[PDB]
Amino acid sequence: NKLEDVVIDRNLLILGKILGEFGSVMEGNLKQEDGTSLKVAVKTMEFLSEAACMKDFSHPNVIRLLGVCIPKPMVILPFMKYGDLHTYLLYSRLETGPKHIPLQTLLKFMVDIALGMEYLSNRNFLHRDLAARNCMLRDDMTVCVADFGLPVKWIAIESLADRVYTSKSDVWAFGVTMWEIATRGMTPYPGVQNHEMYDYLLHGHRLKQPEDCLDELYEIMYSCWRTDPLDRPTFSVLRLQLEKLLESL
Ligand SMILES: Nc1ncnc2c1ncn2[C@@H]1O[C@H](COP(=O)(O)OP(=O)(O)NP(=O)(O)O)[C@@H](O)[C@H]1O
Ligand SMILES: [Mg+2]
């Protein structure tokens, strides 16, 4: 019963336009204890205990859950006016978009996500859906991890092979995300269809090194896709590797 804290009153929520189309995600206004209204995003879909757990997460690189409304469940998240990282990367290759993102900003995006994942990993919370599209830009342009908790080409081999999903599978997905950032938005594995992905990986193939990327960066990405999950580093290792790489630039 005490997990009533996470529940938000339906009349404090005003729903507006669709943002994207399991269920709908909408823009909205949440009335706060402050008297003020906050712009929110609202994803429709036990399940309050996990949401209460997620509500307690508090890190600059992890999206904060505001609460839930219900029997129709909706999760309240802060609206991020700058949107997802994937779209940002792609827009940056176009005029009227952001300017050309230099390597340093790209590496800083990877650090933000790795810090975000280090936090979640320390609390044994699996993300299970990490991709550039589920990484959000704050108003200060720091990145935060989103859409965790509740995509074939972000899924580790052992997880395609069996039902298994660990933090090392999240690590695999972080690797692919790093590649998404390095390539400024390419879909993983050009020329490989989704249904041939398990056989492709089983034969030892991985994402190829982007053209002008440092070997040092590719080394880091690659370590994320080692066949044995135990051979993959932790997020705390990755995080420090990317910090020292960025530092050396
Ligand atoms: N907190 C938020 N603030 C602003 N926009 C958001 C937020 N959360 C999601 N969106 C956007 O709403 C749209 C639909 O969301 P979503 O269902 O997460 O689609 P998606 O990008 O395919 N991610 P997923 O379905 O988790 O793989 C996307 O454009 C999101 O970037
Ligand atoms: Mg998403």
Side-chain angles (χ1 to χ4, degrees), residues 19-20 25 41 63 78-80 84 129 133-134 136 147:
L19 298 170
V25 35
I63 202 157
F79 186 79
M80 301 288 172
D84 74 286
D129 208 18
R133 60 181 178 277
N134 290 344
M136 296 297 152
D147 278 7

Side-chain angles (χ1 to χ4, degrees), residues 18-21 23-26 40-42 63 77-85 87 129 131 133-136 146-148 151:
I18 317 287
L19 298 170
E21 213 73 44
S24 321
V25 35
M26 285 168 281
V40 295
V42 178
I63 202 157
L77 309 148
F79 186 79
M80 301 288 172
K81 80 169 211 175
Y82 291 136
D84 74 286
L85 183 57
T87 312
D129 208 18
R133 60 181 178 277
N134 290 344
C135 293
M136 296 297 152
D147 278 7
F148 50 91

Side-chain angles (χ1 to χ4, degrees), residues 101-114:
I101 308 166
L103 177 63
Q104 304 86 52
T105 307
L106 287 183
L107 276 179
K108 185 55 171 60
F109 292 148
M110 298 174 198
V111 167
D112 289 354
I113 297 153

